[PDB]
Design a protein around this ligand. Structure first.
Ligand SMILES: *[C@@H]1O[C@H](CO)[C@@H](O[C@@H]2O[C@H](CO)[C@@H](O)[C@H](O)[C@H]2NC(C)=O)[C@H](O)[C@H]1NC(C)=O
Ligand SMILES: *[C@@H]1O[C@H](CO)[C@@H](O[C@@H]2O[C@H](CO)[C@@H](O)[C@H](O)[C@H]2NC(C)=O)[C@H](O)[C@H]1NC(C)=O
Lengths: 38, 38
């Protein structure tokens, strides 16, 4: 599945988790607002 | 964590539940929309 803000939850910043990897997380709704009135 | 409409669910009116307290549940979508539309 696509990694999104509905499939995942956020807790803290990125400097704590030993194995954290940089990747894009797609935000539903936030993209839509741009289509509605860019 | 902040109490939001994603963390809780809604069922019924504020009368039957014993010991219900008044507070604000923060809906993220409305907050964004009041910025998007201005
Ligand atoms: C994940 O991304 C962050 C930035 O979003 C990277 O940290 C920055 O890396 C640049 C070089 O590309 C530096 O100039 C910045 O000073 C860094 N900032 C911080 C706060 O570290 C981070 O290295 C990336 N991690 C991986 C594994 O790619
Ligand atoms: C939560 O807020 C509601 C109002 O939105 C309160 O309802 C009022 O209660 C007082 C008595 O406490 C009545 O005189 C008002 O007529 C009520 N108004 C409405 C619109 O219901 C409710 O009491 C509050 N609850 C708590 C625990 O503070």
């Amino acid at each position: 599945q696509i990694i999104t803000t509905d499939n995942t939850f956020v807790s803290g910043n990125c400097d704590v988790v030993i194995g954290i990897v940089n990747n894009t997380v797609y935000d539903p709704l936030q993209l839509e607002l741009d289509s509605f009135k860019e």
